[PDB]
Design a protein around this ligand. Structure first.
Ligand SMILES: Nc1ncnc2c1ncn2[C@@H]1O[C@H](COP(=O)(O)OP(=O)(O)OP(=O)(O)O)[C@@H](O)[C@H]1O
Ligand SMILES: Nc1ncnc2c1ncn2[C@@H]1O[C@H](COP(=O)(O)OP(=O)(O)OP(=O)(O)O)[C@@H](O)[C@H]1O
Ligand SMILES: Nc1ncnc2c1ncn2[C@@H]1O[C@H](COP(=O)(O)OP(=O)(O)OP(=O)(O)O)[C@@H](O)[C@H]1O
Ligand SMILES: [Mg+2]
Ligand SMILES: [Mg+2]
Ligand SMILES: [Mg+2]
Lengths: 441, 104, 193, 401, 398
DNA sequence: AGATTTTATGTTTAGATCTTTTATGCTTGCTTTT
């Protein structure tokens, strides 16, 4: 069957685009132009700059940096006159780990095949002496410090004070480039380190606060591109792979759709996104979080469901994944509890409603439960030990949290709003009527 | 610097008008923004205001007790106001800020 | 008699997920039972049915120290049947050592816990979850030494921890019965002057 | 073998070279005049003679020339807010003294220098000072012993040695042994050491140094005041030369709005470079005043109202309800439960439904990662505390106007 | 992705939706993986066994390298990185060494290969709730290990908690949440009844009883017995392994009238309501010395009678704190014999503390200085039993 | 010219320290039942 395999090619294409498109950048014209002209002036003119990408998580900061590096690196001038040192604040948790990584990535004489010799002090002295020994004739370094706010937390901010100071000095032309999500990262800096920082800052707020931009983004993310665009994209990716993410990138030349298939797919995508139901699902999704990582997660859950029996995306499929997104996940845990733990939570809700959210105890809740169990005519048979193990089963799900003493007398707090328990009372399967009457009063 | 003058005048005003001398950086910045708004001059953001108060701290006029977050840092004046008034050397401005109770 | 029943329990697990485990309702007189557990290690080594670690409460203030003394006791006990530093006796090294030795033949990995009442509760529950995670790959048996009663075992083991427990209860004879036996057969014997 | 490389490094017999460019740097004559101003305005290009720091130059020069010619030794403490021309003036005085000693108008002298933030440990200064003497790298104990053998023992012909020490507050620690040794060595007659110490705080010897260390530091002191409205203009117009690429009102606005904040000179020399880069993309060859206004608005940024306006609608309802609970309860620290109740009230007013609390914790985590609010780890839901980091009037300014 | 779900469905009845979602997200290895998946559910829901069978079938059928973990084992991050790279970089021997998170990312970056072979990696971390209690850079890196290593890997996480508990101050990357719902009564009956041939073979290997059982142990009989079992036991627990391990013993009691010649429900409903009281206890009287008994009931009166009532009872919320001298005073008041203060009596106090019959609510560091506070931790019925064996009527002093 | 303790050194983790802040407890000062 040919129709069974074109859908597999479409699904692998859309999944590979949603997951591995590390250099494509929609939007940010002037900001990308600022970052590109700054790195270009550092590589050519020997200026020592510094920059600080800023913005909410999920906006394309790493994608912007990868786009600028992917368009600058194959120039055979930026690639020959500039060495690039990535650093990350989650992996380089101490100054000496980041310093050994700097010594390796710059290929200094004391590195020797990835095992740096000498102490942290000797590594800092050799790095600063190599940087002081250079000049405009030396190669430009481009430091890229992702998670810069964690680099601010290091002792004395000492590595930061070095990395800025070379940028303030007539030494090697380096370009420090922090990338961080906090909008007030600059007040974390020490006043000396803040003085040596050049205060230019690039904010990357997403450009799709309007809903129509969100619908256009969801349409462009699902449509199959024209084949000449696949040729130009594969040409650019081959140019960045002849010279890091390039070992496992998109490579869109592996997939080549027929014009009738691309036309039928883009027709179905425009017809689905013209519907009021898909627009209502995207409206709720945009109302929660506008960031592109959220939409790509929703679209990956949508594209993953394209079985050969059902090739087409439809508005009911987007409504099903959107109903999967919006549901409360603590009510779905409360519905899985057995009737004894549900009676314990109802006794906890009664003790909280009566005493105005005072902290409870296993003894108080067991007494309030036994006052119902003596007349329940189905709960007479339970032992105190079974109710105690049910209370511990409530405690390990973090539906009950300790105030931070014997395990039967420790004070506790309910972790639920009363509306969540009230919706559990309606969503519960095969609830006995005695518990449903006791819950009302 | 003029922003350091406005910071010292708002700190003297909040220390004079209030029995509780537990002044945070955010509680001081929220009054400093209203004072700059009534003076019809542009106010610094909190990220620059923290560096301004840190630069005033080097003179010994203040002492900042650090906390977990930059908003929660506690400014503590270490000069008396009779010295702060002679140090600012702009009595026509301090007479305007200290008579501005309504902006607190 | 209780020794033969415990050895039959360990060999029956060896003939064959939850870890099998054997509560031993021993008396209040805790120091006396080290000879009992030593006789259990002597029988299990003489049959070549198992290798035994013994986890004292003094050695296990934290989960790290408990795992280190457990792996160190199993490896050095096997070395003493036929010295790595205690910093490097990870459970992964225990799995690699068991595969290098006894995968070709199955010896049980008995872990005596003589003073069950003296343990930290969180360290003991985390250790039971760790030993339950390795069942199938590593055959563990967890005999215990409960000086009080089984209600203490049901109290210190929560719903999640007791979900992975298949315990069997053995009972040591009462201390006054042992005193009466010693007083009648020894201190009143005709043969001593 | 690597050990021969490390031994040649620790003996100093191989200089630490850095890789050179494959392509030659561009010639000076191809540059535009605006590029010439952009490279004269770089902060790394120190002028040969600093404008507006003549009095401090005469002070440090008279102190160092008297300490060198008298062959006695001593100490000095210069201090001031960053960017005020401290280290540039001290190195300019020392370069002038070296130019004078080269012509035999002055006795010759050695010039050691350290910096307290280039050292991982306070004791590593002993490793570095000895590295400016012999060039060997040794352990700090052997280096401290050899430095005591050099300074305590009179060995003619001993030459005068000037030990500049930037960043004195990093070298302190609790024991204060390193700063005590560095200030105690000049007091011995055998050592001709003249130590100069640069720092930021004016009150450092009384604030954190010990009483004997403050007694050794002495009463000779100099304070670098912040640059005023006029000196910052003189600095930038000295950097530009005779070029008219900058309007005089543009430099006046840069100096007027930088001197009002800090008095840093690096801020003025960075804002003028950004103004040159802004004028370059407009294809004009003169930096007119609106380019300076755009560069000033960019580099004294205040982008939190843009962040609140760019938030998703449920996050804006959350930011309204946190300020509503702050106004209602009075205290500035609110639990998540009352914030969620005010969220349900505001969402019932606006007509949109709100996400259930497990998604409201995701909204609170996003605002706490963006630092629009301060919030705890999410493991203690409904009882976690939510400080508002942005001011309450900024939220209404974002969501109304 | 079809063969894996076809091979897992017979092992896992009533999980066709979860197996279908797992085989759509991380089934085929040629297709790119989501960066992280978080499936969650209650105890007994079958997530550890499901991810183990799924990772085993994907590793046998395809090119993937699997790595299963228990995060309780990783008290330090170096243990987790060494086990993860022992599984994802096979046959490295004892030469394997990982210093920190950076070395793990670099050595995983070395494992990337050509796209023709379509390799994949998979990491399951059971007990993922412990990941938020450790180094606070393990969880954010694990949620973007695919972007960091440039490598086709998904990091599955397994916990009893929703992902709303897992957010930190710095935020987190996106994750594909998945919910394993616990079964209703009908699906639980189908799951308990899915092992019918095993119990039928177990009875047929265990001789008139053999033919009278094999002619009457057919599928409707086991289904009706499981209906009679779940009519009483589903109220206390929905936990499937506990229902299995109790239902086998209850069938062993239930089967006797059929072997010995409705008409069954009352004979089992005797024992069935006895097994209901022994639920969660997984089983297949504290003798004391005399003066230890008096010390224990005196500690119970000290923790149960409050400080003010001793003056009226002895001159002749929770359990209360009591100092050791208050315990000795109540012990001498109730003893009515007056033994001396030997070493053995205070040794009995300390060894009652060591057995968790008493407790140290405070003090601890200064037991001898008199600042120590003890708290009795036993129930009233054990005290009444001790007072029966002793002959001291405790209820007079309460 | 190569293997072995030997020693000197650097790192890391557990413990001492500084500082704030919060609390039970030690004492006080009335306070009030028997
Ligand atoms: N402007 C954009 N153009 C293209 N893709 C984008 C853009 N913004 C976000 N994305 C998508 O969002 C997802 C995450 O983006 P990205 O990795 O750039 O965020 P990030 O900058 O790493 O955030 P953080 O650094 O805070 O984790 C990526 O899959 C990327 O495809
Ligand atoms: N009076 C001046 N004239 C010309 N340029 C100046 C003047 N003052 C400062 N600069 C420029 O600003 C920079 C200030 O560097 P300098 O080392 O003097 O700062 P600093 O006061 O030592 O800072 P810190 O105290 O943070 O170490 C110099 O590189 C110089 O180019
Ligand atoms: N749908 C099912 N069909 C058959 N057996 C099941 C099913 N669900 C669970 N089980 C059984 O449950 C047993 C163990 O469950 P498992 O340990 O996977 O639960 P868990 O979620 O890991 O528990 P915990 O969260 O407490 O670790 C397995 O032996 C398995 O046979
Ligand atoms: Mg990133
Ligand atoms: Mg300086
Ligand atoms: Mg499990």
């Amino acid at each position: 069957p040919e129709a069974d395999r074109e859908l597999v090619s479409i699904r692998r294409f859309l999944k590979e685009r949603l997951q591995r498109d590390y250099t494509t950048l929609r939007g940010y014209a002037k900001e990308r132009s600022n970052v590109r002209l700054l790195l270009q002036r550092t590589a050519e003119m020997g200026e020592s700059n510094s920059l600080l990408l800023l913005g909410p998580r999920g906006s394309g900061k790493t994608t912007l940096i990868n786009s600028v590096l992917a368009d600058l690196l194959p120039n055979k001038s930026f690639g020959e006159n500039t060495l690039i040192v990535h650093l990350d604040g989650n992996l380089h948790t101490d100054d000496r780990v980041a310093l050994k990584s700097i010594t390796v990535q710059m290929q200094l004489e004391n590195a020797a095949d990835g095992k740096v010799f000498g102490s942290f002090a000797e590594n800092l002295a050799f790095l600063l002496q190599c940087l002081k020994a250079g000049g405009k004739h030396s190669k430009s370094v481009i430091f890229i410090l992702e998670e810069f706010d964690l680099f601010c937390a290091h002792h004395n901010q000492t590595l930061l004070y070095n990395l800025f100071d070379v940028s303030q000095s007539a030494q090697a032309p380096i370009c420090v480039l922090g990338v961080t999500c906090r909008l007030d990262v600059i007040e974390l800096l020490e006043k000396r380190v803040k003085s040596r920082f050049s205060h230019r800052q690039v904010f990357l707020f997403p450009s799709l606060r309007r809903f129509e931009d969100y619908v256009d983004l969801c349409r462009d993310l699902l449509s199959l591109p024209t084949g000449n665009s696949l040729l130009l994209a594969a040409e650019k990716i081959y140019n960045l792979q002849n010279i890091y993410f390039s070992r496992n990138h998109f490579d869109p030349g592996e997939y080549g759709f027929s014009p009738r298939l691309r036309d039928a797919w883009n027709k179905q995508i425009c017809k689905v996104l013209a519907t009021q139901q898909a627009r209502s699902t995207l409206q709720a999704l945009h109302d929660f979080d506008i960031s592109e990582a959220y939409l790509k997660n929703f679209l990956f859950r949508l594209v993953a469901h394209l079985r050969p029996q059902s090739p087409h995306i439809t508005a009911e499929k987007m409504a099903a994944v959107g109903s999967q997104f919006e549901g409360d996940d603590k009510i779905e845990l409360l519905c899985g509890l057995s009737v004894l733990e549900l009676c314990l939570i109802i006794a906890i809700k009664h003790h909280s409603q009566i005493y105005d959210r005072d902290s409870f105890n296993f003894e108080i809740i067991y007494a309030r439960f036994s006052k119902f169990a003596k007349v329940s005519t189905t709960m007479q048979a339970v032992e105190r030990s079974i109710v105690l193990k049910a209370f511990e089963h409530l405690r390990i799900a973090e539906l009950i949290m300790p105030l931070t003493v014997q395990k039967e007398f420790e004070m506790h707090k309910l972790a639920l709003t009363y509306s969540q328990i009230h919706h559990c009372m309606q969503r519960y399967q095969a609830l006995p009527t005695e518990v449903a009457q006791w819950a009302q009063s | 610097p003029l922003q350091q003058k406005l910071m010292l005048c708002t700190l003297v005003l909040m220390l004079r008008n209030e029995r509780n001398k537990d002044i945070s950086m955010g509680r001081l910045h929220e009054v400093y923004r209203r004072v700059c708004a009534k003076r019809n001059i542009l106010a610094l953001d909190q990220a620059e205001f923290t560096g301004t108060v840190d630069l005033v701290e080097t003179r010994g006029i203040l002492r900042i007790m650090r906390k977990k977050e930059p908003r929660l840092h506690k400014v503590l004046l270490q000069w008396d106001e009779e010295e702060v008034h002679a140090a600012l050397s702009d009595k026509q401005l301090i007479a305007s800020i200290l008579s501005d109770t309504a902006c607190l | 008699r209780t020794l033969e029943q415990l050895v039959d329990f360990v060999v029956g697990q060896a003939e064959r997920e939850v870890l099998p485990t054997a509560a031993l309702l021993t008396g209040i007189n805790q120091p006396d039972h080290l000879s009992q557990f030593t006789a259990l290690t002597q029988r299990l080594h003489a049959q070549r049915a198992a290798m035994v670690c013994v986890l004292q409460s003094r050695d296990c203030a934290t989960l790290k120290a408990a795992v280190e003394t457990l792996v160190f006791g199993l490896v050095e006990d096997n070395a003493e049947v036929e010295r790595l530093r205690r910093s490097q006796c990870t459970m992964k090294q225990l799995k690699s050592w068991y595969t290098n030795n006894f995968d070709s033949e199955r010896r049980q990995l008995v872990v005596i816990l003589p003073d069950f009442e003296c343990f930290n509760a969180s360290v003991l529950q985390d250790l039971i979850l760790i030993l339950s995670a390795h069942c199938g790959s590593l055959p563990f048996v967890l005999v215990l030494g409960v000086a009080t009663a089984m209600t203490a075992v049901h109290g210190t083991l929560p719903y999640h921890v007791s979900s992975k427990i298949r315990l069997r209860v053995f009972q040591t004879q009462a201390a006054p019965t042992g005193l009466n036996e010693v007083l009648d057969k020894v201190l009143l014997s005709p043969k001593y002057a | 073998t690597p050990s021969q490389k490390m031994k040649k490094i620790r003996a100093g017999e191989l200089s630490p070279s850095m890789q050179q460019r494959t392509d030659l740097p561009a010639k000076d004559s191809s540059k535009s005049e605006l590029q010439l101003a952009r490279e004269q305005l770089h902060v790394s290009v120190v002028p040969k003679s600093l404008p507006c720091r003549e009095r401090e130059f005469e002070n440090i020069y008279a102190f160092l020339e008297g300490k060198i010619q008298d062959q006695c030794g001593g100490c000095m403490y210069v201090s001031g807010v960053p960017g005020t021309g401290k280290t540039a003036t001290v190195t300019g005085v020392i370069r002038t003294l070296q130019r004078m000693a080269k012509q035999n108008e002055l006795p010759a002298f050695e010039y050691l220098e350290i910096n307290g933030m280039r050292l991982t440990e306070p004791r590593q200064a002993y490793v570095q000072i000895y590295k400016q003497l012999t060039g060997k790298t040794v352990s700090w104990e052997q280096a401290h012993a050899l430095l005591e053998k050099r300074f305590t023992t009179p060995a003619p012909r001993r030459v005068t040695t000037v030990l500049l020490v930037d960043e004195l507050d990093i070298l302190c620690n609790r024991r204060q042994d390193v700063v005590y040794n560095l200030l105690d060595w000049p007091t011995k007659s055998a050592a001709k050491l003249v130590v100069v110490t640069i720092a930021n705080t004016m009150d450092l010897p009384e604030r954190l140094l010990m009483g004997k260390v403050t007694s050794r530091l002495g009463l000779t002191r100099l304070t670098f005041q912040p640059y005023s409205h006029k000196q910052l203009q003189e600095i930038v117009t000295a950097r530009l030369g005779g070029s008219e690429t900058f309007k005089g009102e543009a430099v006046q606005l840069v100096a007027r709005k930088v001197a009002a904040v800090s008095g840093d000179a690096r801020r003025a020399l960075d804002i003028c470079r950004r103004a040159t880069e802004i004028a370059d993309t407009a294809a004009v060859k003169c930096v007119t005043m609106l380019h300076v206004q755009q560069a000033l608005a960019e580099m004294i940024a205040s982008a939190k109202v843009q962040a609140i306006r760019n938030c998703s609608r449920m996050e804006q309802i959350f930011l309204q309800a946190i300020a509503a609970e702050v106004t209602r309860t009075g205290v500035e620290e609110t639990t998540f439960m009352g914030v969620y109740q005010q969220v349900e009230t505001i969402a019932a007013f606006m007509g949109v439904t709100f996400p259930p609390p497990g998604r409201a914790l995701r909204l609170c985590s996003k605002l706490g990662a963006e630092r629009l609010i301060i919030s705890e780890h999410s493991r203690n839901d409904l009882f976690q505390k939510i400080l508002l980091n942005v001011s309450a009037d900024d939220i209404h300014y974002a969501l109304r106007v | 992705m079809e063969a894996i779900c076809s091979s897992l469905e017979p092992l896992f009845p009533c999980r066709e939706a979860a197996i279908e979602t797992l085989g759509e997200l991380i089934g085929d290895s040629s297709e790119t993986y989501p960066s992280a998946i978080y499936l969650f559910g209650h105890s007994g829901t079958g997530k550890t066994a499901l991810t183990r069978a799924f990772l085993k079938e994907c590793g046998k059928r395809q090119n993937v390298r699997t790595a299963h973990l228990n995060a309780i084992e990783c008290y330090t991050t170096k243990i987790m990185l060494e086990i993860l790279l022992d599984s994802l970089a096979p046959d490295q021997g004892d030469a394997l060494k990982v210093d920190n998170m950076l070395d793990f990312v670099e050595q995983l970056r070395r494992q990337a290969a050509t796209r023709v072979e379509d390799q994949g990696f998979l990491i399951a971390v059971d007990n993922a709730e412990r990941l938020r209690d450790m180094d606070a850079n393990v969880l954010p890196v694990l949620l973007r290990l695919q972007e960091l290593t440039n490598l086709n890997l998904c990091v599955i996480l397994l916990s009893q908690l929703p992902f709303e508990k897992f957010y930190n101050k710095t935020g987190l990357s996106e994750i594909v949440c998945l919910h394993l719902a616990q079964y209703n009564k009908a699906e639980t009956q189908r799951i308990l009844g899915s092992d019918f041939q095993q119990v039928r073979n177990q009875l047929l290997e265990q001789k008139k009883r053999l033919e009278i059982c094999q002619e009457a142990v057919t599928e409707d009989f086991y289904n009706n017995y499981l209906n009679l079992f779940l009519s009483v036991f589903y109220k206390a627990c929905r936990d499937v392994p506990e229902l299995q391990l109790t239902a086998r013993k209850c069938l062993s009691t239930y089967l006797e009238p059929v072997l010995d010649g409705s008409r069954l429900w009352r004979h089992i409903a005797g024992p069935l309501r006895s097994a209901l009281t022994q639920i969660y206890m997984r089983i297949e009287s504290l003798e004391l010395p005399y003066y230890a008994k008096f010390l224990l009931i005196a500690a119970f009166l000290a923790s149960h009678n409050a400080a003010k009532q001793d003056k009226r009872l002895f001159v002749k919320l929770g359990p209360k704190s009591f100092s050791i001298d208050r315990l000795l005073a109540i012990f001498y008041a109730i003893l009515e014999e007056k033994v001396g203060l030997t070493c053995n009596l205070l040794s009995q106090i300390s060894t009652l503390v060591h057995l968790n019959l008493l407790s140290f609510v405070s003090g601890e560091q200064n037991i001898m200085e008199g600042s120590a506070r003890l708290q009795c931790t036993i129930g009233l019925e054990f005290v009444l039993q001790i007072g029966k064996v002793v002959g001291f009527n405790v209820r007079q002093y309460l």
